[PDB]
Amino acid sequence: QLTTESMPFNVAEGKEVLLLVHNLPQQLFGYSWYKGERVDGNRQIVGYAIGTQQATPGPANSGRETIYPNASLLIQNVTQNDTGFYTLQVIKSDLVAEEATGQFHVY
């Protein structure tokens, strides 16, 4: 199963967290990250197109995140308010979506 996991789960204020992503399918066309536990357009952080390697910031983009070619999401300068769930959507070459949710806590 597609999974995402924070490294570290417990994150000091002002430091960084990497959302690692595991069990990707091959032949992917894009990624989309969201704040919260589901796919919710109003809370899209970033979208990525594999074909062109272009990142497009969404309405939940903070300016403090980077999505990598392997789907992982690095968040820097973390704030208390960053504590939450983060949902990844992967779009395969047949346009079928897979999703995973992960989370971290800022202290």
Residue numbers in the entry: 1 to 107
Provide passages from the article that reported this PDB entry:
Human CEACAM1 (hCEACAM1) is a single pass type I transmembrane protein expressed as 12 alternatively spliced isoforms that all contain an N-terminal V set fold of the immunoglobulin superfamily (IgV) ectodomain followed by up to three type 2 constant immunoglobulin (IgC2) ectodomains (A1, B, A2), a transmembrane sequence, and a signaling cytoplasmic domain. CEACAM1 function is triggered by intercellular or trans binding of the IgV domain, resulting in higher order surface CEACAM1 oligomerization and subsequent intracellular signal transduction. In contrast to other immunoreceptors such as the T cell inhibitory and mucin domain-containing protein 3 (TIM-3), programmed cell death protein 1 (PD-1), and programmed death-ligand 1 (PD-L1), CEACAM1 serves as its own primary ligand, owing to high affinity homophilic interactions of its unique IgV domain, as well as an important microbial receptor. The displaced CC′ loop forms a cleft with the FG loop that exposes the key residues F29, S32, Y34, V39, G41, Q44, Q89, I91, N97, and E99 critical in mediating homophilic CEACAM1 interactions.
